[model samples]
Target chain A: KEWQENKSWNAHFTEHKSQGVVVLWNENKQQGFTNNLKRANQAFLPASTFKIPNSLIALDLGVVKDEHQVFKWDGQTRDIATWNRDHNLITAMKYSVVPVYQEFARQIGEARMSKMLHAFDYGNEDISGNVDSFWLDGGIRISATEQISFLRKLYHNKLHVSERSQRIVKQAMLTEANGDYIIRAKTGYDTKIGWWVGWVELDDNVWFFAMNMDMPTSDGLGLRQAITKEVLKQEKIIP
Target chain B: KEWQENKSWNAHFTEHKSQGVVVLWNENKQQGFTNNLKRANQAFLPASTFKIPNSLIALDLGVVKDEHQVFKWDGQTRDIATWNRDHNLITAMKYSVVPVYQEFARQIGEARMSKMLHAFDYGNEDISGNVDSFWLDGGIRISATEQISFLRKLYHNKLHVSERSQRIVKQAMLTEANGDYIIRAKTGYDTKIGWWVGWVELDDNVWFFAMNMDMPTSDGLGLRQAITKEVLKQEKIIP
Candidate 1:
C-alpha cells in the first residue's frame, strides 16, 4: 500500500519520444516508487508479460513438462523467424513464441485456466475472447502497479500454485544473472502498449518493477530498457 | 545390463520368514547385483513404490501445485493414525497417503495419465481398474529389475519429463540425508508382497536398488531395510 511517485522520471520517457509509467517496489524497503503514478495504476492487456503467470499455469497444470517441455510448430509461419520450428519452454520463453503458448492455452483449456488466472491474481482475469490469444488481444488487462503486486507474490513463492511451478517460471524469466546482480524479466507488445515486467536481485535485496507505455514503432523496444535502467540508476537502487 | 547374484542375501529374507527379491545397480560400475534373480525379474504390484511415478505424473501434469501444495484430509478416517490430518506433498509421501493421490488421479484423469505411464515406462502401464487404486490392485506390475530400469532413468533425468519434475519427485522420495551418505527410498506393503525401492548416493558413486518379497505378514516391514543395508555392507557399497 505504500507508494511514492518519481515525478522526475517524466524526462526519461520524454527523451524516448514516448509517455510511459514505471513502478518500482523494494520488499526490503517496504515501499513502492513510481513515475506517472496515475498511469502506473491504469490497466492494459498484459501482452507477452502474461507469459510469466501463463508459464506458471501451464507448468502447474502440466500442459508443458518443465523448462524443457517441447512444443511443436503447427506449420504456420509468423513474424518472428525464431518461432518457425519446435521450441522447448526455455526457447519459447526466450523468443516469446506466440503460437507455442497458444497451443498451451488450448491444452490448459478455459475453465481451469480461468481459475488459474484468479489464483495467480493475474490482471483482469478475462480470457473472454479466443483462449490462445486472450493475453494478446482479449479483455484481460493489468496495470503496472498490479504487475508489481503479482511479481511480488511470485518472488516470494506466495502464489496459490506450487512453489516449484513458480520457481520454474522464475528461472525461465531469468534474462541475466552474473552473481553481482540478477535480472529476471519479460517483455510484451502490440499496437497500443508495450510492457516490461520483472524483478532484480541485488545483494540481500529484491526489487520488483513494471513498465508500460506507447510503443510508437514497437521497434522502440530498446527504449524500454534504456528508460527503465536510467530510472533505476536515478533512484540509486542500482549502480 | 550386467547383473551378479549375491546368493547370500537369501539369509536375510529367511530371518524374517519370507521369500523376497532384491536388485542393486551401481551405474558407476554399470552393473546390477541381485538376490533371487528369477524372482527379481518376476513382476508384482509396485505397491507404494508406484508413488514415485504417480507423484511424477501429478507433478508434471500439474494436478498438485508443488511440494507444499496441501491436500485437505477427508473426514473419513483410515487405518493409519496419520491419515486423519491434512498433508502437503512431502508429508503425504511420508505417510504414503492414498486418498490424496486418489484425488490427484481423478484430477489427472485416464486418457492423459495413460500417456504419462507409457512415457515413464512404469510397470506394465495398466490403470485398467479404479484409476486411483490401480497401482495397488490393478494389472500394472513392476519387477524389481524393472524398477531398477525406471529408477535409472529417473536418476539420470532421462525420462520424457522436465528435469525439475524428476528433481521434485526425487526430493519427495528422499527419506534421509546425512552429509556423508544419503538414502533416498520408499517402502510398501500388502497381504501378498512388501517392497523397499530406492537408491544411495555415496562418495562419487550412486547405487540403485529395489526389494520385493512374499510378505508373510505385512508386519515384516523392518526386514525390507534390514535385508537391504546388510547387502549394501556385504557389497561394501557403504562404509
Candidate 2:
C-alpha cells in the first residue's frame, strides 16, 4: 500500500485485443460510461462475484455469526491446495474458496436465497437450478450495467438489507487501502468470462466499476484485475 | 500456472542501484554465482527466514503435529489485519505470521530449540534474545552464502531431522510452480533488510538461491522477489 504512495513500482498500460466490456459510473454525477454499452447490458453468470451478496445474505441470516466463525474442512480436497483446510470468513474470502460459499448457500436454502436476492434487487432473481450453485451455473445472471447499480448501492449503504450486514461485507471486500484512496473489489470467473467488479473510493468522490473479459485460456485469469486496474489508471482513479 | 506457459505478462528487468546481492548456486556443479561475494558473506538478522528451521524444530519436537495444525489468535490486534485471525501452518507460512511461529518457539523450549538449530547447523545456531523474539531481533545472523547450504540440505533431505519433518516444511514453502519450473521460497523483512531464499527445480536439475537487499524505504519490499526472479531470468531459469 505504501509502495504505491512512494511510486516505486509503476504499471504500464498496453493495448489489448481481448473481447470484453469495461463500465465505469461516477456516483455524484449519476452518469455511466462503457467501452461497449451493448455488451455491458448483456447478462452472464455472476460466478464468485456473487460472494458479495452471498456474504451479505449469510451475515444477515446468521448462517455465519461473524467473520471469526470457522468453516472446518470436510477433507474433500479440491484442485486448489488452499481450499483443503479450515477457514474463517476473511481467509475464505481471501482465497475465494468455492466450497465454503457452497456451504453458505446450502445453509441459506432456496427460499431465503430467493427472498434475499429479490430484496437486494440482485440479478434476475433467478434460483432455477440446484440450490447451492444457482449463482455460479444455474439460472442467476447479471450484466455489467446492473453490477454497477448494485455496487453503487452497496457503497452508499442504501441496499434493502440490514446496515450492519452490508457494513461487514463492505469491510471484508476492501482489497487495498492507502491514505489517499481505497479499493474494494472482487473477481469472478465462470465459463468463458472473467469479471472484476468493485468501487474505488477517493477523497470525496467514488467510482463504481464492472469489467468482464472473455478468457479464452487461463492467461486471461490475471487480466481480470489487470485491465480493471488499467481502466482506473486511464481515469486517474489511482496512481 | 498455465499463464506463464502461454507467455502472458512478460517481465522486463531493469538495472537497479539498490544495495543488494543475488546468489545463485548450482547444486550438482558445486559452484556459485553472485553479484557481490563480500555481501554474500556479510551477516544479518534472519528475520522470518528463521521459520524454515523453526518449523523443522517444532515438527520434530511434536510441538506442532503437521501443516493442518491451527494456530489460534489470542485476541491480540496487529498492524496487519490478516495476522489478527486464526491460521494453519500453510496459511500462517503464506502470510509469514510472526505470532504463530512464536507460539511454536514457546512450545519448543530452550533445550530443544538450541539442540535443533545445532543439529541443523542453521544460521550460526544462535538463540540469544528472548525465547520468542530472538529470531526476530537476535544475536543470530546468517549470510547469503550460509543460506545456500541450509537450503540445499533441506532440498536433498539430508538435514539432521526426520524425513517427514523436512518433507513437510519443504511442501509448505512452495510459493509457485508451473510446468517449466517450481519455486519454493520464503521472504523475510526486518528493519531495513529484506531476504528471499529458496530453490528452483527444473527438469531434474535445481538451483539454490538466496537474495538480500537494503530497504531504504518500503519500495524495496517488492524487490526481494522482483530481483530474485530477474536473476533466475538472467541465468535462463524461467521465462
Candidate 3:
C-alpha cells in the first residue's frame, strides 16, 4: 500500500496521455511504485494476460494433457499472422492464439472455471458474459495490484495449481534470457489498452511487473513492452 | 497456501460432522490450519459477518457520520431482545442489532452499498438480494479463506477505508482485553448456521479465526462463541 510515485516513468506517458503503470517487486523496503497512482489501481479487462492462468488451468485439469497437446488449426485463417497455424499449449501461448484458449475454456467449462477463478481470486472474478471472449472485453476485470498479487503467487509456486502445472506454464512463459537473468512474460492487447506483465528472475530475487497503457493505436501496444523494459532496465533488474 | 491440518481441533467436529473450520494466523512457518479442507473453501452466506464491513463502509462514507450517531427505534419490535432499543453504531455492533443496521443500509442506499462492497471486495461482492438482508441469507457468499483475507486487511489497516474509519470500526470490535492480549471479534448467525469470526491480538502477532457450524438448534448458536473462545484458549492466544 505504501507505493512511491515514479514521476520519471509517468513522464513517458505524455504522448499517450491516458496511460498508467504499476510495478510491484518483492524486495527490500521499496516494494511498489506507480505512474498516475489512481489509475494503477483501476480495473480493466486483462486481454491476453488471462492466458497466463488460462494455460495453467488447462494443464492442471488435464484439459490439454500437456504442452505439446495439439490443437488443430481448423483450416481457418485469422487476421493475425501467427494465430493461423496449428498450435499446442506452448505455441498457442507464444502466439497469443485466442481460439486455442477459447477451446481450452470451453473444455474447462463454466462450472470449473468459476471454481478455479474463485480459488485463485482472479480479478473481480466475474465471468458472467460470453465465456470465450470474457477476458477480451467481457466481465472479468483486474487492477494492477491484483495482477501483482497473482504473479507473486506464481513466481513463488504459491498458487493452488499443481507444482507441475505451474512449472509447465512458467516454462511456456519463458520469453528470453541472458547470462545474468531470465525474463518470462506475456503481452496482452485489446483495441483500447495493452499490458506487459511478467518477471525477471535474478540470482537472488525475482522482479515482477505489470504495466498497462492506453492503446488507441498499435503504437500504444508497442509501448506496453517498451515502458516495461525501460523500467526494468532503469531499475537494473535486467541487463 | 501451505496449511497444516489441525487433527485435534478437527476431532471436535464429530457431533456436527458436516461443518468446516479454517483458522489463519499472521505468524511463522505455520500460517494456516483447517478442518474439512475441501469444505473449508466452500462459499456460504456470510450472514451478519457482512455487518463487519458494512459498518466500516457506513462509517467511511459518512452514512452514520460517527459511531455515536443514533438510529432511533421505529416502534416495531423485532424477535431479539437487542433489536427493540434505539442504538448507535457501537451498541448496535455490540448487540448484533439487526434493525439498526438495516436502517443504516437503507440510509446508505443500494448504489452506494454496491459501490462500497465492490471496493472492499467483500465476499462475492453480490448484494443483489434485498439491500438490508442480502448478506443475511441472500446472494452474498464468502469462503473461510476470503474471510481471513478480509480480516487480515482490516487488522493491518490495509483496506481502502480511511484510517479513522478503520480505527473506529476496530474500536467497536473490541470485545475483551487483558494485560497480555486483547480480543476483538464478531458473531453471526442465520437460522441454519452460525459464525464466530475475528482476531485476538497478541504482542507480536494477530491470530485471526473464522468458524461456522450447522445450527439446527439454538445449541449451535451458543457453540459459535464457546468453540471460538475455546480455540483461542487452546492456541494460547487468550487465557
Model 1: DockQ vs. true structure:
0.03
Q: Which pairs of residues clash in candidate 3, taking residues 3 or more apart in a chain or in different chains? A: none
**Deviating ranges (above 4 Å) for candidate 1:** B1-239
Worst 10 residues of 3 chain B by lDDT: B11-20
Q: Over all chains combined, what TM-score does candidate 3 have?
A: 0.49
For model 2, the superposed segments whose C-alpha errors exceed 4 Å read: A1-239, B1-14
Per-residue C-alpha lDDT of model 2 across residues B1-239, encoded as one tens digit per residue? 10112111123223566678777788767778877777888888999999899998889888888766777888999998879988877667778899999989998988888898888887788999888989888788899989998998998779988877886787668676434666778899987899999998754368899989888787668888987887788678889
**B133: Cα error in model 1, Å:** 49
Please give the DockQ score of every candidate, comma-separated: 0.03, 0.02, 0.01
lDDT of 3 by residue, A105-216 (tens): 8899988888888888899999877787888978899988789888888866788998768867876776764346666788888888788888876544667788888788
DockQ rank, highest first?
Answer: 1, 2, 3
Interface RMSD of 2: 14.6
Arranged by lDDT with the best first, the candidates are: 1, 2, 3
**Candidate 1 per-residue lDDT over residues B54-126, each given as its tens digit:** 8888888888777767788889989998888888886788888888888888898988888998987888888
Flag clash pairs in model 1. A62-B61
Model 3, residue B227: displacement in angstroms? Answer: 72
